[PDB]
Amino acid sequence: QFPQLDPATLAAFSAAFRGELIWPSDADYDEARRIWNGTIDRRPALIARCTSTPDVVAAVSFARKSGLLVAVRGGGHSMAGHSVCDGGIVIDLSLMNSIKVSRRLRRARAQGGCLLGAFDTATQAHMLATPAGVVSHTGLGGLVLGGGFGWLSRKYGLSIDNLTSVEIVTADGGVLTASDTENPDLFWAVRGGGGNFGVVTAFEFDLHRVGPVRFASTYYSLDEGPQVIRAWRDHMATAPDELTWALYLRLAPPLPELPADMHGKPVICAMSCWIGDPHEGERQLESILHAGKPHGLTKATLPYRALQAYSFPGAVVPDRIYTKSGYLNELSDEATDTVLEHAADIASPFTQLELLYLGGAVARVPDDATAYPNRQSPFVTNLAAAWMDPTEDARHTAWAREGYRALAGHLSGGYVNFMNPGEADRTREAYGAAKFERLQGVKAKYDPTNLFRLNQNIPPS
Amino acid sequence: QFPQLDPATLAAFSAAFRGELIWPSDADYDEARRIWNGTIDRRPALIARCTSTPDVVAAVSFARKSGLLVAVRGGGHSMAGHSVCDGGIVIDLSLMNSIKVSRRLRRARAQGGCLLGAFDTATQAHMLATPAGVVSHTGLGGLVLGGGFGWLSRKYGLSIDNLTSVEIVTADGGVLTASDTENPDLFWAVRGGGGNFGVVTAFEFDLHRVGPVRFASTYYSLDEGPQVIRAWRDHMATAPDELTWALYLRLAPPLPELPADMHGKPVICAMSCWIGDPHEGERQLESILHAGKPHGLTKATLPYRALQAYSFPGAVVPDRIYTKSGYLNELSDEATDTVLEHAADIASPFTQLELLYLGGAVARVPDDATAYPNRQSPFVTNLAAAWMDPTEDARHTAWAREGYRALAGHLSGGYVNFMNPGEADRTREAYGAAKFERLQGVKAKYDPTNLFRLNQNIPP
Numbered sequence: 001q002f003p004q005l006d007p008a009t010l011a012a013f014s015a016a017f018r019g020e021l022i023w024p025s026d027a028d029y030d031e032a033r034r035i036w037n038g039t040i041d042r043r044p045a046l047i048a049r050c051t052s053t054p055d056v057v058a059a060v061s062f063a064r065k066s067g068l069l070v071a072v073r074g075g076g077h078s079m080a081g082h083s084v085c086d087g088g089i090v091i092d093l094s095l096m097n098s099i100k101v102s103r104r105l106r107r108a109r110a111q112g113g114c115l116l117g118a119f120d121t122a123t124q125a126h127m128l129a130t131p132a133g134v135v136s137h138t139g140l141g142g143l144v145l146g147g148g149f150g151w152l153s154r155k156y157g158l159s160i161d162n163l164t165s166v167e168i169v170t171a172d173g174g175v176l177t178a179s180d181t182e183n184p185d186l187f188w189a190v191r192g193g194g195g196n197f198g199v200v201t202a203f204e205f206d207l208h209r210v211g212p213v214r215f216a217s218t219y220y221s222l223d224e225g226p227q228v229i230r231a232w233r234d235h236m237a238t239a240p241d242e243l244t245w246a247l248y249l250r251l252a253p254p255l256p257e258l259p260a261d262m263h264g265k266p267v268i269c270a271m272s273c274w275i276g277d278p279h280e281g282e283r284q285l286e287s288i289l290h291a292g293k294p295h296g297l298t299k300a301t302l303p304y305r306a307l308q309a310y311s312f313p314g315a316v317v318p319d320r321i322y323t324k325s326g327y328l329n330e331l332s333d334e335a336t337d338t339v340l341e342h343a344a345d346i347a348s349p350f351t352q353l354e355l356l357y358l359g360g361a362v363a364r365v366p367d368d369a370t371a372y373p374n375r376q377s378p379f380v381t382n383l384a385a386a387w388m389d390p391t392e393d394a395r396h397t398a399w400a401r402e403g404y405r406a407l408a409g410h411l412s413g414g415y416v417n418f419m420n421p422g423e424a425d426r427t428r429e430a431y432g433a434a435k436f437e438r439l440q441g442v443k444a445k446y447d448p449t450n451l452f453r454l455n456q457n458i459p460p461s
Numbered sequence: 462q463f464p465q466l467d468p469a470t471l472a473a474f475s476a477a478f479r480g481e482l483i484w485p486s487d488a489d490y491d492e493a494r495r496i497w498n499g500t501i502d503r504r505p506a507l508i509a510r511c512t513s514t515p516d517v518v519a520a521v522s523f524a525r526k527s528g529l530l531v532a533v534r535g536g537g538h539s540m541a542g543h544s545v546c547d548g549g550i551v552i553d554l555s556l557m558n559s560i561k562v563s564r565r566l567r568r569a570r571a572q573g574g575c576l577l578g579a580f581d582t583a584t585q586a587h588m589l590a591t592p593a594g595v596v597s598h599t600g601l602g603g604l605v606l607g608g609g610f611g612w613l614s615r616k617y618g619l620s621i622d623n624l625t626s627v628e629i630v631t632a633d634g635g636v637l638t639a640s641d642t643e644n645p646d647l648f649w650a651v652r653g654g655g656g657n658f659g660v661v662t663a664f665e666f667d668l669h670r671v672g673p674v675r676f677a678s679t680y681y682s683l684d685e686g687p688q689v690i691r692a693w694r695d696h697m698a699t700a701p702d703e704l705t706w707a708l709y710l711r712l713a714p715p716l717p718e719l720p721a722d723m724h725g726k727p728v729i730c731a732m733s734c735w736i737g738d739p740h741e742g743e744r745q746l747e748s749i750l751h752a753g754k755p756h757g758l759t760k761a762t763l764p765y766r767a768l769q770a771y772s773f774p775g776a777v778v779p780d781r782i783y784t785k786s787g788y789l790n791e792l793s794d795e796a797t798d799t800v801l802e803h804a805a806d807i808a809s810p811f812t813q814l815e816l817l818y819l820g821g822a823v824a825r826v827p828d829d830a831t832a833y834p835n836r837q838s839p840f841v842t843n844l845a846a847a848w849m850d851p852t853e854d855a856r857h858t859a860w861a862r863e864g865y866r867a868l869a870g871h872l873s874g875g876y877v878n879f880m881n882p883g884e885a886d887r888t889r890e891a892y893g894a895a896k897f898e899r900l901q902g903v904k905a906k907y908d909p910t911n912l913f914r915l916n917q918n919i920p921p
């Protein structure tokens with residue numbers, strides 16, 4: 001926390017760095033060191049709030065020369081707590097939030113500290129968009145480096161499936177461009193390989209015209225759980241790419257569109273949208289609303305930016321979280337009953353068991369085309385415990401582990417962006433042998449000293 | 462657009478500047494110089510995309526020493542076309558988009574090139590908010606400098622009502638902080654005085670906790686205009702601050718919630734929300750949804766970031782715009798009949814005659830407390846023509862001038878942020894005589910040479 005640093009190397013850093021520094025003595029230190037996973041409480045020796053690529057260069061070099069453990073933070077959403085370290089440096093990108101958008105080229109160049117909401121605002125000024133996650137205050141940086149999925153994915157792929165190049169500052173402090181024609185080995189590995197390979201300071205995306213989106217959300221009783229999940233599973237097997245439909249098993253939020261009788265009870269929250277013409281969307285969405293008896297139905301036609309900003313409306317932002325996730329190739333009747341059993345035990349108002357269906361454009365990309373594993377597994381499940389009181393940490397986490405272990409025979413792989421702080425040992429199984437090996441090769445070449453290790457880490461061969 | 466420039470001056474600029482420069486022969490020049498108002502087609506000598514306060518200092522100094530006319534651009538939304546110039550320099554702030562939010566202090570610090578949706582995204586990470594306009598790709602910069610109202614304004618006041626300081630780069634190239642206790646004269650004037658005083662590089666705002674908001678939108682046939690508008694004006698006179706309710710007279714959008722038989726027909730779009738508990742919200746909104754026979758009802762409970770991003774679902778972004786706007790102290794029956802007459806002439810899809818009701822927290826601030834005029838006038842009406850084809854410019858433009866002149870007997874003042882490119886002459890009437898005089902005194906102190914004149918200009 002207060003390590004001795006060489007004064008000369010510190011002075012050099014300072015003259016070269018135009019951003020803001022935050023030291024452990026400063027009034028804003030405790031707030032700046034907080035990340036969205038409030039169970040992570042770590043005290044860096046320094047927070048370096050970078051404002052340009054040269055800033056990031058100066059910070060990487062200063063960390064390398066100084067031997068400080070490097071944490072890189074984009075939006076701070078790491079479910080594993082990777083964006084803050086004890087005793088090291090946080091290379092904080094959050095003030096690097098610029099997006100340039102060319103309407104004529106349908107192209108966006110976004111800085112590596114951008115929030116999704118900032119990105120979506122900029123592109124939707126021209127009615128353009130590309131795929132990213134569903135929660136507006138997520139960081140673009142960590143999400144895209146992991147793959148990145150959300151509302152537009154079945155139609156347009158992962159965020160990485162629309163990435164055309166990056167600017168990246170590597171461990172030696174060099175700046176590189178990686179694309180299909182420049183450093184293509186590196187460009188393959190950052191598309192799903194995390195922060196393993198250097199600090200991405202700029203992402204370039206291809207964009208799509210995305211007009212108003214017919215959206216519906218509704219709640220079903222858990223009593224109809226088997227019928228609704230089976231309807232969903234079967235429907236999605238053959239659904240148009242334009243339909244996206246997610247199920248979130250949760251306590252029903254105390255909202256006026258729901259009967260007060262249902263408040264605080266476990267329910268299925270079904271969220272769905274049609275990426276395409278809204279009169280077609282009305283017809284498609286209507287055909288799936290009656291999976292069970294619907295309650296608290298909201299239907300609306302939203303600009304895409306509002307659909308992005310919609311998840312997940314509540315009075316409280318949860319302080320503490322714990323996730324256990326994996327992919328499924330098939331969702332059997334026995335797996336569904338497991339899901340529903342564990343759902344009924346849910347305790348916190350903020351906890352959910354989510355069941356996502358990917359496939360569509362995501363699956364049509366050849367497996368070896370990026371470092372993202374598991375394109376062929378269309379289902380994702382996430383036991384996302386979330387709560388407030390730290391005295392309850394044991395009970396919440398036990399809930400998520402029990403559900404995972406009960407589902408374990410059905411699960412395969414794992415999305416790097418959904419790993420928790422105790423899942424370092426999941427990296428090889430999540431990527432697979434062929435992928436984990438080619439990633440190690442690229443690690444050996446670009447970060448042979450493993451300067452970047454506060455991520456779902458790939459050690460160099 | 463290709464002036465002769467001094468090599469020493471230019472070299473000084475280059476050395477001190479760390480942003481991106483765009484010259485006329487660059488491939489991204491034509492796209493960079495386009496602003497929201499597509500009727501404004503202008504060619505600067507230079508576009509300087511600043512990336513920090515010292516960038517802005519360098520660009521201001523350079524423009525002053527070169528005698529380049531200065532345009533300042535935050536989000537490019539100027540209804541008057543002020544953010545681009547022929548032959549000058551555009552100090553383009555769009556890359557200065559960062560926001561720091563303290564949860565513990567309920568405070569944010571936003572750079573001068575931020576977009577509303579970026580600001581709202583950052584503060585809503587902590588369930589916090591402060592009032593701003595209703596379209597997210599609007600620039601925070603020009604919006605706040607002229608006042609700024611939107612959904613949270615009845616409860617929480619104008620954007621400026623929540624501003625506690627600014628960092629500003631003045632015409633002589635100095636950097637200054639202005640607040641209630643530091644250069645308070647300048648702090649009074651930037652709250653409503655536009656970009657007249659320098660380039661704001663950071664805005665600091667107090668925030669409020671804003672959770673899920675109950676929201677409703679519905680359409681009424683224009684036939685029921687007299688009773689709908691009367692219901693609205695009478696109800697807003699005594700409405701809780703928590704309720705915001707606006708009317709948009711327009712051709713009905715081809716949305717699936719509206720019957721096919723109303724598409725493109727003359728309607729009132731009523732948009733409302735309750736800033737407060739959503740169960741109370743459901744009750745209050747139910748009470749106003751039958752002002753006439755409702756059609757195409759949407760009700761949702763939305764995070765505030767989604768309410769902000771909502772205005773408005775449409776598949777085409779309008780290229781050309783022209784606005785005529787005023788305040789009303791009262792909306793009589795004859796004024797009502799006048800607006801309904803002119804709304805029935807709307808014969809194209811993207812134009813709106815908007816009818817807003819402000820008051821609440823906005824009218825509770827003493828009138829001399831900021832440079833924003835017209836706090837005691839609750840109504841704003843905006844004839845907002847919007848269209849695509851340049852050959853139609855004269856027809857749309859005429860529609861809006863005709864409505865404004867028919868209403869002119871009822872109208873007073875004007876919101877600076879709704880002025881068209883031909884309304885330079887309205888500045889005095891907008892502010893009123895006492896404000897405009899206090900404003901010219903501040904202008905003589907901070908911008909005596911009127912370097913910053915591409916705004917609703919206040920000469921010193």
Ligand SMILES: Cc1cc2nc3c(=O)[nH]c(=O)nc-3n(C[C@H](O)[C@H](O)[C@H](O)COP(=O)(O)OP(=O)(O)OC[C@H]3O[C@@H](n4cnc5c(N)ncnc54)[C@H](O)[C@@H]3O)c2cc1C
Pocket residue numbers: 035036071072073074075076077078079082083093112113132133134135138139140141142143144145146147148149150194195196198199200201417418454455456
């Ligand atoms: C509420 C919530 C909702 C989510 N929803 C979705 C979703 O819908 N879809 C989805 O795909 N994912 C989603 N996620 C998971 C998310 O993708 C990961 O948490 C992601 O890692 C967050 O990125 P970030 O920059 O905010 O996080 P950080 O904690 O800042 O960073 C995460 C990791 O990326 C590295 N990193 C970040 N930026 C850079 C950069 N510019 N260059 C190099 N390395 C970098 C960090 O070192 C760290 O290892 C969500 C997360 C949260 C908390």
Ligand SMILES: Cc1cc2nc3c(=O)[nH]c(=O)nc-3n(C[C@H](O)[C@H](O)[C@H](O)COP(=O)(O)OP(=O)(O)OC[C@H]3O[C@@H](n4cnc5c(N)ncnc54)[C@H](O)[C@@H]3O)c2cc1C
Pocket residue numbers: 496497532533534535536537538539540542543544554573574593594595596599600601602603604605606607608609610611655656657659660661662878879915916917
């Ligand atoms: C679709 C749309 C919706 C709108 N809705 C609302 C609304 O709901 N409520 C509302 O109050 N207003 C609203 N407006 C009006 C808006 O407030 C003005 O158009 C505002 O001037 C736009 O700010 P800007 O930075 O985007 O524009 P710009 O064209 O970039 O700038 C406008 C003026 O501000 C100056 N300027 C901009 N940034 C700075 C800065 N950082 N420092 C100094 N000078 C600066 C410019 O020189 C120019 O004179 C809206 C505008 C549009 C186009």
